[PDB]
């Protein structure tokens, strides 16, 4: 019974491999010979946000490119005004460990998650004048690794028990569940149209999920180690992943395989966060060796380097209008690069 | 109007700064412990006497201690343990004695010690179930270890009264198996502090305290380039 199923699975894998090799007509690094180089991108530090006591673990820009949420391990969640460097809100968390934080598209809600297995959604309206827990969600059995707001009432979450969830905030119940991974699920990224999303796990595979249907469509296995970062290309039809193997990879949703690999022989450190720019020509990757490399996303050459941090870069965010790039590291500082 | 907003947000900034300057003192005063142990080993008795994560908050000699018990997690530690590179000490609890659980404990301690993000944290080590070792001398360690026979009891480690010398030899052998791992790398950044404990004991809390101070003292002596 097991032999006829395992051999069938091997046959189907070989069929998919042969379909991919059949559709491999050429590479991205061949049709991009006559493209102008991006030159030397020399970015400068314009601000330095200094309020956190412990290491900063995750951050998220707001949709107005004005406010950003930063989450530390000291139990504080701080909302920064990026222009004037004034702290607008400081929220004390019930647990000490935080792994994710998200700022809602409308600016009304802030969600945070950590080892506590409970995703806390805070209402920033506060007609009383003080922040308050709107609703805490407790339906996971591992640890909450990443969460993202689809809209005001729906939030997608990633857990460390190999499953992803979709919540309804008003009821507090799980609308559906996503069960396809065989390892810890590290991070996820939402498409611009909020129709599909990707999930990267610790089995070196990335799963493309349909939010409304509840099934996965595609499985991308181009990596050698655990995938930490995952970010959609600005048109929603490609995405880049950052693994511990020290290589970045660019995948496609229609060619159903990798287009290009970003690697350099002098880099043996893991990747902790990636994010594309507004146009998509630059790909920013935060590495474990205390700096962020600015890769040319169509030539696989380093446009530049952001060597401002003194400890492991943990999170990286690009504004919705591309005006600035904010990076957060374990030295408890937020550098806003021009 | 443009000045009122830039006054209101200045006052909001000052209030948040005062709150973080009253919380920084608390965060800097309280010490943090990670109570990491195997399931077979009795860390439940330890949490009693001494969701996803559990927390114990206590104080000894006007010193605050948060101790964190990893609760309902997954067996894959390589990701969430990277949240713990800022605790002041990892308390590691193992039960001396089915599989070879001691070897699994050795491998876990080795992975903790060699880990890149856990090279600057010290480990406090409890060897539990010291009574069952005494009760096993008349009825396993030799079978799973080919080096137990070619081993003598330390000339420089004194044995407590009323202990069968075979049991002291087994104790010090088990200790030295963790010590060879901790002295192997020898970077000179962190130290391993082994202890003994019964299934029911009360000195444990005093022990941890008398080692956490030592860790803090060694940290200051690293700053002045003396050790």
């Amino acid at each position, epitope marked *: 019974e097991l032999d006829q199923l395992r051999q069938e699975a091997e046959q189907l894998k070989n069929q998919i491999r042969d379909a991919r090799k059949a559709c491999a007509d050429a590479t991205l690094s061949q049709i991009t010979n006559n493209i102008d180089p991006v030159g030397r991108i020399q970015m400068r530090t314009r601000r330095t946000l200094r309020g956190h006591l412990a290491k900063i673990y995750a951050m998220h820009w707001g949709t107005d490119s004005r406010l950003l949420v930063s989450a530390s391990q000291d139990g504080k969640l701080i909302i920064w005004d990026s222009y004037t460097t004034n702290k607008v809100h400081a929220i004390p968390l019930r647990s000490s460990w935080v792994m994710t934080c998200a700022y809602a598209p409308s600016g009304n809600y802030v969600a945070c998650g950590g080892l506590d297995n409970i995703c806390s959604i805070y209402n920033l309206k506060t007609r009383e004048g003080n922040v308050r827990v709107s609703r805490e969600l407790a339906g996971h059995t591992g640890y909450l690794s990443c969460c993202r707001f689809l809209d005001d009432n729906q939030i997608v979450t990633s857990s460390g028990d190999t499953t992803c969830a979709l919540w309804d905030i008003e009821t507090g119940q799980q609308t559906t569940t996503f069960t396809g991974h065989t390892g810890d699920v590290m991070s996820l990224s939402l498409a611009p149209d909020t129709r599909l999303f990707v999930s990267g796990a610790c089995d070196a595979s990335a799963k493309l999920w349909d939010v409304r249907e509840g099934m996965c469509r595609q499985t991308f296995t181009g990596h050698e180690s655990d995938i930490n970062a995952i970010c959609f290309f600005p048109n929603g039809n490609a995405f880049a992943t950052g693994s511990d193997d020290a290589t970045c990879r660019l995948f496609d949703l229609r060619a159903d395989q990798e287009l290009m690999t970003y690697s350099h022989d002098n880099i043996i450190c893991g990747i902790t966060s990636v994010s594309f720019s507004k146009s998509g020509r630059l790909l920013l990757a935060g590495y474990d060796d205390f700096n962020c490399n600015v890769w040319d996303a169509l030539k696989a050459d380093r446009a530049g380097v952001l060597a401002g941090h003194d400890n492991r870069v943990s999170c990286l965010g690009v504004t919705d209008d591309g005006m600035a790039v904010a990076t957060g590291s374990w030295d408890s500082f937020l550098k806003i690069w021009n | 109007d443009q000045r009122n907003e830039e006054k209101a947000q200045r006052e909001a900034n000052k209030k948040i700064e005062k709150q973080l300057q009253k919380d920084k003192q608390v965060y800097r005063a309280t010490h943090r412990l990670l109570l990491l142990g195997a399931g077979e080993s009795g860390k439940s008795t330890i949490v009693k006497q001494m969701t996803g994560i559990f927390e114990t908050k206590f104080q000894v000699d006007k010193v605050n201690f948060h101790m964190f018990d990893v609760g309902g997690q*997954r067996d894959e530690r390589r990701k969430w343990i990277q949240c713990f590179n800022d605790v002041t000490a990892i308390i590691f609890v193992v039960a001396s004695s089915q599989t070879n659980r001691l070897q699994e404990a050795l491998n876990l301690f*080795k992975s903790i010690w060699n880990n890149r993000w856990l090279r600057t944290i010290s480990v406090i080590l409890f060897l539990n179930k010291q009574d069952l070792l005494a009760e096993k001398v008349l009825a396993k360690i030799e079978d799973y270890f080919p080096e137990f026979a070619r081993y003598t009891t330390p000339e420089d480690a004194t044995p407590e009264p009323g202990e069968d010398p075979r049991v002291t030899r087994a104790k010090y052998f088990i200790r030295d198996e963790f010590l060879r791992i901790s002295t192997a790398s020898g970077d000179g950044r962190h130290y391993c502090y082994p202890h003994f404990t019964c299934a029911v004991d009360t000195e444990n809390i005093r022990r941890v305290f008398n080692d956490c101070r030592d860790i803090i003292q060694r940290m200051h002596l690293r700053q002045y380039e003396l050790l």
Partner: nanobody, 126 residues
Framework: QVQLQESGGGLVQPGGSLRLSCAASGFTFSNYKMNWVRQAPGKGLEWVSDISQSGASISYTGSVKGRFTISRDNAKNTLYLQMNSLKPEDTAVYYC?????????????????????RGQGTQVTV
């Protein structure tokens, strides 16, 4: 795609000798520390032995120390295990396991909960 394919095994008599192989396909084999894990019938996963990247540093579990010989071949991309003086207590399913990260010293690969980086296994019975 990281894939590991164990080779060798079978029913053997005690006091004999047997070799195993691990075909490592889809990754840079030279940069990963690797090891052997076994599952005794009705028992949990227990660590047997390991080998570093270069092959200099080798360690064994005590109960089989001096009885097994682990060796990696970076030329042909294969992990090679020799087992002499076999014992009736050494029957198990054998797993060729890889450490998750490159260029490191620590590993976390005793997890029975579907650890992704180990092969399907081979049966050794005495």
């Amino acid at each position: 795609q990281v894939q590991l394919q164990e080779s060798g095994g079978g029913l053997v008599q005690p006091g004999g000798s047997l070799r195993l192989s691990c075909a490592a396909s889809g990754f840079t084999f030279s940069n990963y520390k690797m090891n052997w894990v076994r599952q005794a019938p009705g028992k949990g996963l227990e660590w047997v032995s390991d080998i570093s990247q270069s092959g200099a540093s080798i360690s064994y579990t005590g109960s089989v120390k001096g009885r097994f010989t682990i060796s990696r071949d970076n030329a042909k991309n294969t992990l090679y295990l020799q087992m002499n003086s076999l014992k009736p207590e050494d029957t198990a399913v054998y797993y060729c396991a890889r450490c998750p990260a490159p260029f490191t010293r620590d590993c976390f690969d005793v997890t029975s909960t579907t650890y992704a980086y180990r092969g399907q296994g081979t049966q050794v019975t005495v």
